[PDB]
């Protein structure tokens, strides 16, 4: 049956890429001119994976218990290492999300990539991405949530640096790799600690052993807390949360399909995915849930504040998705396990729609700047309508899914620690503002400066269907999402969000559509907080000043010590045994009488210390 | 269960020897198209 | 078998001086056939290699007047490295096709140091060990001084001087342990089964250390490495960086953990802090260095710290992490320095800021070099990460081991800094102007791609299912560490 | 030295005084740690 060849899911795409990789290295010209059949081959592989995952998801919602099939990977005398797969319902959900988004985006990128070199290497990278993340999801243990959690990082390095002809992509890829290696430093120390203390890594025994040990002594209270925030320092890098957020928007120098996978709930979700599968390390530690929550909250306020003053559409959606990841991490912090993943399962669809629509408009712009693209929708009906739907999703207007997601999380934040409410609330207002000036500046008005495919547009509709219909698996009258995903009246609270969103959309309508206030003179006047938040909260300059200079100076501080204080000391040995020879030969002077001296006077000292 | 390297090696190394002798013939840049040098790095 | 393995390359090398030619072509095929036949002898003598001790040892008697015996012996701890040298020196010869300057001497010295590298592992006599350790000097000296580099004078001279003056206490130490009692042993086993007092255990240990810490360069005992690995062509370098450092590590294991365990237990913290110093030091000195080759040499110096930590641990896992790191770096650095040699051959330049965007026309070396660079750092799916992870786990499982892990994991951040900065400086960006008018090398002739593909298959096969390489020495390392814990 | 002329362009790092008070820190660091390790 199924559940035996579940390991087959990462292998088909990988294999595809592998073959195509051997086709890009050997037989380069053929596979470079063999564009579309390789594409649909990789697509068939991902489609088999998608059908397999869908059948698993159906067999798991219908009813079954999890089926893990592990194997011993690295062995030694007493201890062991396990590396296999488990299929719990959360894994199946994330699996189907990954597969569907990857299939649709692969079809999209069949059209996004015009006559262009690198049409097959792209799909090779993208199938490797599929394998990597699909293998990350199916993971009983934590060591396997580092292997693929870094394979996805290198694949992001590759995809960002697709256009290696350019210079900005190289720096962006280097940055987005190094920041994730900081995250790896964190999670690696956390793993080595959780193995040092407990003696196993399975996400369930790791909690039983921790609560058992803390019931006794042998480590407490901050000796189980230091190696629990290090684990969280991985998601901070991979889910773009504060303070490791600078890598995500600069990764937008890469293509749009890429930026739609690795900014949907496919890669950055991995962070919160980890936080889902580690609550049996965090639930028995209320000293770090608070840290996680306020981290997510400050991230939300950050991404909401920066995106307003931006003018580049893609680089604005970057801070938007940072903010939404912040909402999810907030929900993870204060208790909620089955409400952060609802926003995840909703955010893997409308944000991808927005990125794909951005790719469509920037492709139909012969750039990238909202200020130089005025009223479209005279030629972009489908893209504009679906962008509008995804824009409604990330704000109020309750029939759409993002309200049903950003009501549960807000309710959880209100019942527990309502001080963190009233900041998230205005932040939702800021979402409603920037996402609708992203529309009124872009798809409505007069086309200021100076037309839509088919393959590029079907995915947007196929994702618009979820983004309007996902909200109805929440809805706390017949809630099915919380029962299928479990951890091991309300109008006064909900309608406030819709009212604040109406405030935001109204302030956006009267300000960019016609502009009866002064969008320029509100920032070309006394107010300096347009410069701030357009220099993106100087963190970038801060790191480039204090940190990148630090190692770059310390390297010389060490290397001259190496080339002078270490090397010169031993070369001095050769110098000494050279000058000794140069100065001792003068004993030999070319005089027989000097030998007559130091022959018999050379001895007669040998008699003095003799008798 | 456990997998052993012995038949893997026995199956790979003849292919390695044959492909080594084969790709020894396949060459290029070093012959005439460029590279007046002599493989010394001076 | 081992005697045939060691003597057939050397004996067949003595035929090269009387071997027809018109320009220099039929020498390299002969050398490659010799290397391939000998590798076949390795892997065919590996069929009858069961997997605890010397699974085959063929002793003889040359000089009974001293105690010298031609005691070859394979082992779980020495057979992977024998395979490694038999594979990687063959691929060095399969990389040295364009050698036109004095090819007879090239393919004689290369075959001489092909038996001079299998012998150091397939030897159990402490005098013949010294002989084989020593006979790497003149061949490497000529390999560096004739072809390869402008500073090759200072490099080769410094190499031979340091690897003679620190090939110095190995004999002294073998003697110092040979005549403690009333038996003229000169044999690994018979001399490991002797009770050595602490008063000179930790003196003979330092004698071994001054030797095994210059070839496995530790804190200042490295300054020969940048000069000898910078002024060196690729196929020379593959040997010099993939086998000899492993020779130091192997001999360190077998002479300081089976044979002086009581002093090992007292000095191991030194090796540990030295290893993390090695990592951070080499990584900073690599990110500072700008040329192209010295960078990767310091990267090797960085990667050896995992070996120091894994040997200076005391569990059954750190040792395997060390050996796995060794077999990993032997496969990684070889491809790295091969690609560096190729890139120099196409550009006739090493310096980074003097070239950029070369990956627009020379867009075959860029992929291979990116892959080997990802393999250098502790990337999962490869053997470079399995070693690091096993080192961390095994060490922490055993200097209050929470600070040294924190300092050794800095390499995880600090390796991609200079590697990816090197990639950015070389291959990314817009093509240079006519300042680079060397005609960007016709992207890696299939013959280079085969080299790196056959170096890049075993590494992935290890990184996915590492037991392939660990099935070899689970028994031997188990016995070694059982002994070293039985003392304590 | 004069070879290290790149983005690595810190001026006050090649002088003998700064090299001395850098080697002091590095040697004292390894020495504090070797004393921490033995004891
Ligand atoms: C039986 C077990 C099976 C398991 C095997 C597991 C290993 C899996 C390996 C899968 C490798 C998939 C990647 C394939 C992409 C190759 C792309 C290529 O060769 O481009 C080669 C391209 C060829 O260039 C392409 O084709 C034409 C060539 O003329 C065009 O002109 C353009 O160059 C471009 O279209 O080279 C370049 O021009 C650009 C190079 C860009 C840099 C790519 C380096 C990527 C290397 C990643 C390798 C990671 C593998 C290690 C990680 C292992 C993870 C387990
Ligand atoms: C010989 C030998 C060995 C080996 C063995 C083993 C370990 C094996 C395994 C094997 C296996 C188990 C296999 C696997 C396979 C895989 C593959 C097949 C993949 C990869 C490859 C390829 C595909 C490549 C390609 C490329 C290039 C070349 C460049 C870059 C890009 C790419 C990556 C694409 C050892 C080490 C012991 C030692 C020495 C000798």
Swiss-Prot record, chain C:
GO terms for cellular component: plasma membrane-derived thylakoid membrane. It is a multi-pass membrane protein. InterPro entries: NADH_Q_OxRdtase_chain4, NADH_Q_OxRdtase_chainM/4, NADH_UbQ_OxRdtase, ND/Mrp_TM. The chain crosses the membrane at residues 1-19, 29-49, 81-101, 105-125, 127-147, 159-179, 199-219, 233-253, 267-287, 304-324, 325-345, 377-397, 402-422. It is an enzyme of class 7 (translocase). NDH-1 shuttles electrons from NAD(P)H, via FMN and iron-sulfur (Fe-S) centers, to quinones in the respiratory chain. The immediate electron acceptor for the enzyme in this species is believed to be plastoquinone. Couples the redox reaction to proton translocation (for every two electrons transferred, four hydrogen ions are translocated across the cytoplasmic membrane), and thus conserves the redox energy in a proton gradient. Belongs to the complex I subunit 4 family. One of its GO terms (biological process) is ATP synthesis coupled electron transport. It comes from Thermosynechococcus vestitus (strain NIES-2133 / IAM M-273 / BP-1). This is NAD(P)H-quinone oxidoreductase chain 4 1. Keywords: Membrane, NAD, NADP, Plastoquinone, Quinone, Thylakoid, Translocase, Transmembrane, Transmembrane helix. One of its GO terms (molecular function) is ubiquinone binding. It catalyses: a plastoquinone + NADH + (n+1) H(+)(in) = a plastoquinol + NAD(+) + n H(+)(out); a plastoquinone + NADPH + (n+1) H(+)(in) = a plastoquinol + NADP(+) + n H(+)(out). It is found in: Cellular thylakoid membrane. Its EC number is 7.1.1.-.
């Amino acid at each position: 049956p199924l559940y035996q060849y579940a390991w087959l899911i990462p292998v088909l795409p990988l294999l595809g890429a592998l073959i195509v990789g051997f086709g890009l290295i050997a037989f380069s010209e053929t596979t470079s001119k063999l564009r579309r059949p390789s594409a649909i081959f990789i697509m068939a592989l991902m489609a088999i994976a998608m059908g397999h995952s869908l059948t698993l998801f159906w067999s798991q919602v219908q009813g079954h218990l999890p089926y893990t099939q592990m194997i011993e990977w690295a062995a030694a005398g007493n201890l062991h290492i396990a590396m296999g797969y488990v299929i719990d319902p959360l894994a199946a959900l994330m699996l189907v999300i990954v597969t569907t988004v990857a299939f649709l985006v692969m079809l999209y990128s069949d059209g996004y990539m015009a006559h262009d070199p690198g049409y097959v290497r792209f799909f090779a990278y993208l199938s490797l991405f599929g394998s990597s993340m699909l293998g990350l999801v199916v993971s009983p243990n934590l060591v396997q949530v580092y292997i693929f959690w870094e394979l996805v990082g290198m694949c992001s390095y590759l995809l960002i640096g697709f256009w290696y002809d350019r210079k900005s992509a190289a720096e962006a890829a280097q940055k987005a790799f190094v920041t994730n290696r900081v995250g790896d430093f964190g999670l690696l120390l956390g793993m080595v600690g959780l193995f040092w203390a407990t003696g196993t890594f399975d996400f369930a025994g790791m909690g039983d052993r921790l609560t058992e040990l803390v019931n006794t002594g042998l480590l407490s209270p901050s000796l189980a807390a230091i190696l629990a925030i290090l684990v969280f320092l991985g998601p901070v890098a991979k889910s773009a949360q504060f303070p490791l957020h600078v890598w995500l928007p600069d990764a937008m120098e890469g293509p749009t399909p890429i930026s739609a996978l690795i900014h949907a709930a496919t890669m950055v979700a991995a962070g919160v995915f980890l936080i889902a599968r580690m609550f049996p390390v965090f639930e028995q530690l209320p000293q770090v849930m608070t840290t996680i929550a306020w981290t997510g909250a400050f991230t939300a306020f950050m991404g909401a504040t920066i995106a307003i003053t931006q003018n580049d559409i893609k680089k604005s959606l970057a801070y938007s998705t940072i903010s939404q990841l912040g909402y999810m991490v907030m929900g993870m912090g204060v208790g909620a396990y089955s409400a952060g993943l609802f926003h995840l399962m909703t955010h893997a669809y409308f944000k991808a729609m927005l990125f794909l629509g951005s790719g469509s408009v920037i492709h139909s712009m012969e750039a990238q700047d909202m200020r130089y693209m005025g009223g479209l929708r005279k030629y972009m009906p489908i893209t504009g309508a679906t962008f509008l739907v995804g824009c409604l999703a990330i704000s109020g207007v309750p029939p759409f899914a993002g309200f049903w997601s950003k009501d549960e999380i807000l309710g959880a934040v209100f019942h527990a620690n309502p001080a963190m409410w009233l900041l998230t609330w205005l932040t939702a207002g800021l979402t409603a503002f920037y996402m609708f000036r992203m529309y009124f500046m872009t798809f409505e008005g007069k086309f200021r400066n100076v037309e839509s495919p088919w393959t590029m547009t079907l995915p947007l509709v196929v994702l618009a269907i979820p983004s309007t219909l996902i909200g109805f698996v929440g809805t706390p009258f017949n809630n099915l999402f919380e029962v299928f995903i479990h951890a091991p009246e309300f109008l006064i609270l909900g309608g406030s969000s819709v009212g604040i969103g109406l405030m935001g959309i109204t302030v956006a309508y009267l300000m960019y559509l016609k502009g009866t206030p002064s969008p320029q003179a509100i920032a070309k006047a006394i107010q300096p907080l347009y410069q701030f938040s357009l220099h993106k909260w100087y963190f970038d300059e801060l790191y480039e000043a204090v940190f990148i200079k630090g190692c770059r100076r310390l390297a010389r501080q060490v290397l001259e010590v190496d080339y002078n204080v270490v090397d010169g000391v031993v070369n001095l040995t050769g110098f000494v045994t050279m000058v000794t020879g140069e100065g001792l030969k003068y004993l030999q002077n070319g005089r027989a009488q000097f030998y007559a001296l130091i022959v018999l006077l050379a001895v007669l000292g040998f008699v003095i210390f003799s008798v | 269960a456990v997998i052993s390297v012995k038949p893997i090696l026995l199956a790979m190394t003849p292919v390695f020897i044959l492909l080594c002798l084969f790709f020894g013939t396949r060459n290029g840049f070093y012959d005439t198209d460029q590279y007046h040098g002599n493989a010394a790095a001076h | 078998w081992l005697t045939t393995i060691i003597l057939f390359p050397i004996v067949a090398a003595l035929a090269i001086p009387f071997i027809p030619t018109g320009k220099g072509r039929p020498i390299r095929w002969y050398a490659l056939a010799v290397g391939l036949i000998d590798f076949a002898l390795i892997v065919y003598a590996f069929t009858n290699f069961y997997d605890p001790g010397m699974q085959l040892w063929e002793s003889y008697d040359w000089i009974p007047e001293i105690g010298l015996r031609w005691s070859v012996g394979a082992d779980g701890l020495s057979m992977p490295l024998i395979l490694l040298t038999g594979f990687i020196t063959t691929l060095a010869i399969l990389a040295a096709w364009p050698v036109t300057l004095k090819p007879r001497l090239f393919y004689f010295l290369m075959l001489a140091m092909y038996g001079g590298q299998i012998a150091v592992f397939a030897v159990q006599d402490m005098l013949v060990f010294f002989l084989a350790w020593e006979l790497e000097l003149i061949p490497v000296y000529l390999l560096l001084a004739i072809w390869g580099g402008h500073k090759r004078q200072y490099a080769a001279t410094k190499f031979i001087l340091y690897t003679a003056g620190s090939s110095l206490f190995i004999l002294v130490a073998g003697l110092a342990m040979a005549f403690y009692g009333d038996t003229v042993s000169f044999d690994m086993q018979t001399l490991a089964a002797k009770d050595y007092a602490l008063g000179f255990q930790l003196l003979v240990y330092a004698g071994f250390l001054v030797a095994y810490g210059v070839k496995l360069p530790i804190v200042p005992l490295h300054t020969w490495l940048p000069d000898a690995h910078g002024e060196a062509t690729a196929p020379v370098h593959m040997l010099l960086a993939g086998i000899l450092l492993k020779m130091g590590g192997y001999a360190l294991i077998r002479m300081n953990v089976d044979m002086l365990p009581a002093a090992h237990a007292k000095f191991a913290p030194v090796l540990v802090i030295l290893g993390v110093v090695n990592i951070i030091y080499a990584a900073l000195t690599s990110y500072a260095q700008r040329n192209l080759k010295r960078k990767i040499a310091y990267s090797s110096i960085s990667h050896i710290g995992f070996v120091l930590i894994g040997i200076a641990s005391f569990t059954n896992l750190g040792m395997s992490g060390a050996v796995l790191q060794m077999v990993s770096h032997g496969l990684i650095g070889a491809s790295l320095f091969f690609l560096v040699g190729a890139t120099y051959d196409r550009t006739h330049t090493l310096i980074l800021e003097e070239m950029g965007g070369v990956g627009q026309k020379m867009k075959k070396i860029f992929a291979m070099f990116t892959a080997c660079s990802l393999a250098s750092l502790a990337l999962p799916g490869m053997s470079g990460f399995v070693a690091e992870l096993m080192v961390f786990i095994g060490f922490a499982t055993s200097p209050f081991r929470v600070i040294v892990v924190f300092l050794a994991a800095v390499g995880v951040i600090l390796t991609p800094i200079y590697l990816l900065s090197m990639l950015r400086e070389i291959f990314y960006g817009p093509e240079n102007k006519e300042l680079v008018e060397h005609e960007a090398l016709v992207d890696a002739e299939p013959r280079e791609v085969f080299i790196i593909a056959c170096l890049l298959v075993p590494i992935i096969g290890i990184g996915l299912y590492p037991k392939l390489l660990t099935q070899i020495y689970d028994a031997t390392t188990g016995q070694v560490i059982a002994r070293a814990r039985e003392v304590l | 030295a004069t070879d290290f002329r790149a983005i690595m362009k810190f001026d006050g790092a090649d002088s003998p005084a700064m090299i001395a008070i850098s080697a002091v820190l590095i040697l004292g660091f390894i020495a504090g740690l070797i004393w921490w390790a033995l004891h």
